[PDB]
Amino acid sequence: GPNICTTRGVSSCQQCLAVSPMCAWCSDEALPLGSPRCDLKENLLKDNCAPESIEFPVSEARVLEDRPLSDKGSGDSSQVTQVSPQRIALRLRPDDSKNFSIQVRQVEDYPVDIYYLMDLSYSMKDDLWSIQNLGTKLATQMRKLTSNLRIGFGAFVDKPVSPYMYISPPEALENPCYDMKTTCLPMFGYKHVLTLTDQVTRFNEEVKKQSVSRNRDAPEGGFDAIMQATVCDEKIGWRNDASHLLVFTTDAKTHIALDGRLAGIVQPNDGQCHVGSDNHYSASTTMDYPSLGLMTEKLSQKNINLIFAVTENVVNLYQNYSELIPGTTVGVLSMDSSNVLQLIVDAYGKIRSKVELEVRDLPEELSLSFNATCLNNEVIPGLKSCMGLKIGDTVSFSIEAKVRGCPQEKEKSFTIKPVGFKDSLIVQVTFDCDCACQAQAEPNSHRCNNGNGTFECGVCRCGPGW
Template sequence: AEGLNLCTSGSATSCEECLLIHPKCAWCSKEDFGSTKSITSRCDFLQNLIANGCAGAIENPSSSISVVKNVPLSSKGSGQSHLDVTQITPQKVALNLRPGDQTSFRVQVRQVEDYPVDLYYLMDLSLSMNDDLDNIRNLGTKLAEEMRKLTSNFRLGFGSFVDKNISPFSYTAPRYQNNPCIGYKLFPSCVPSFGFRHLLSLTDKVDRFNEEVRKQKVSRNRDAPEGGFDAILQAAVCKEKIGWRKEASHLLVFTTDDVPHIALDGKLGGLVQPHDGQCHLNEANEYSASSQLDYPSLALLGEKLAENNIHLIFAVTKSHYILYKNFTTLIPGTTVEILHKDSKNIIELIVKAYNSIRSKVELTVWDSPEDIGLTFTATCQDGLSYPGLRKCGDLKIGDTVSFEVAVEARSCPAEDTSHTFTIKPAGFRDTLEVAVTYSCRCGCTGRAAPASGKCSGNGTYTCGLCECDPGYLGARCECEEGASGDLHMALCREAEGKPLCSGRGECSCNQCLCHESEFGNIYGPFCECDDFSCARYKGVLCSG
């Protein structure tokens, strides 16, 4: 290779150090390698080591990959036992990485047809939503009819929210205790405010949904923002009570006509404890920590929705569309649609959002180790490669997309370290588990021979070199340190205070062994001479 040789100039003193310099560097573990006059670097490019006569004793591990589990993709969702549906392949790979040596594997993802759907309808029951309540009284039946065109296995659930029933969010004076609408001429009677109520667990009996909706009455809160994020979090984490199925696609439809309270707003009501991300539904299926915990942050919401594979659909009125659109960029796997003032368009909205969700695939990475670099290249429906992209859009249900995942270890962790991380399409329950081990040790290190005859019995012979025991020096540990030890070293210095062997060689007992250089010869008792340092004229030494 022309130019500077990375491997030889890295001055590696052991096989492991050599491997870390560059993924193309190899180590020669042959005993009698190089000439006696100068040190031939054992760390070099593979072709140089072979040219220098080291074939058969070269340490040069490379990254490798093996597929551990590879069940083929399913074509349909509801025909077979649902737990067997596969939407990502492979499901498990094992990587053995040499630092700097990139390796890659291909992941395929398919949006399987006729996949079961669980839809939980979360409704804002503040006063301004009264006309919406009238309009969704028969929603269950109509929605089920529409959704059954998309999946033969559909279940529906229902919950509602207003806001925390404490001041300044709600009316808390004694006269408002049972009816916060007292004295409000436009709407004189309503129910007390509440944080979140889970009303109907996911069921395929859609008439139950209609019955529940008909029982609901609106409430009145004091400030404009609502406590919807409290409700979203409970709907996401209370899996057993809500009834989310492992084998279904999870949709959470959030309908509101106002802005939400977010983390730190709780301080206004004296709530300083951050949300713990846990389920707090009591026997009556009401959110019991409403007046103890602050509202959740966007980060916590995003984490819990992703953890439970939930697609959040914001169905919001036009005036708040931009705000919620901005939220979707901060909470992955979320969509936003415009809800008419009276919720008339809710069915087409849900169908549109469902189709939008099923039209894209985005890979997410969980628990990725810090010392591992991942790069993605997406191959979408148009057959083109998109480097740096980990998502595809404009898909039809049943389409398959693939991703090239390149993995590179940046360093060597402590010995015998292994890592596992997960690649998961957002909103899918399917995952790909990646187990990583590191190739940082040389095979010859495992064959090290202590007190070896090759090292005059005074050191460990490993990978072609002697590691001398304390008190011994020399390439073969043949010199004893001690009274004359400093003298041995002194004989390698041109003058006191000068570097050993002019910094261009190694002192073995009392002799300098000079390094090899790409520029020419280094020689002399102290490696002080060379044939490439004279002045050049037109690039030629001593004008030729």
């Protein structure tokens, strides 16, 4: 009987496919006048339509790259597969939808970078003494989780400028601790100390030569250091294929953007690297503290997992900042940093306990839907993220793409990538809206109103200009 393909009364092969994903077009010549050309593929063959003249595209989805998921992230020149498949070809006809899947694994024995960014104001003097063996102690525990560990060290205080800095007497500039009965370093904003390296004894000996300084106001310029430790890729030494942990230890509040106006500093933070050969932040006294949004942008750009290892007197403060900076982890640090080792380990496990999908360059006419399979084969509809995972676990997601109408550009591509992951799934979309018979049309055909029309797919169409 009649259906939406026939009752619509289409005028061409392209209009026929645009009715419904089930409609087909018969380009055959020997077709009765009353019989419609736009019908189900079964009805066309039923009416003796030539099988070669049947235009009936089918939405499909075939893989192009399907590397197996790696059992070990160790070894290789970063030939580790975390996402499977890596590339698929997607074909869609108007208003139709096709599905596909994706697998994500938290690979075991994946390399790890850990940059230790430490508050070195006067209250962290006892903290320096407890971490003099942290490098070797941290190497022993992380060895159970990874075989490629690199560690580095940086230090900060605050912007070396009045009123943060004591500027009288002249002795106080070389030794801020003059009025007491000790000596401390001159004030410094942020200084890089140790590039990320696998020689952990370099961490110990560099720490043993570090000492604290002294400034006036309790809030400190650690956010300046987080920005520089993030955007100065080459100097800190982050590796391309490794987890990036930025450990931030402090026992006080922090300065934020627009605080610098109390020092006469109004220039916004430019998010660029300003650590030269002297390993000191040169824009400390001329550029304002960075904003939370600018920090989030650079942390996401460099795949840096920030870790707020702070004392209990400011945990609530940094827990609230952590909610404004997604992907950030908080741990409670003792008043002498004696527990920082276990804190870093727990933070690393918490970091790699989540898989969260993200979509890039998705066309306007395409809409996606996700079904998560975390834990043991338990489907969770309308979800694109898993939690509570362990190293070595594997999750999967079922994805359905729904195109609206037919776009102008017939070939686009988008990406499905987990947050923080290197690998990703590339979906090469192809919008099959036209018919193959259109490539062999007859312009100015002598079958269509004395050359006033075009003959394509077995029918007469009005030519250009009409």
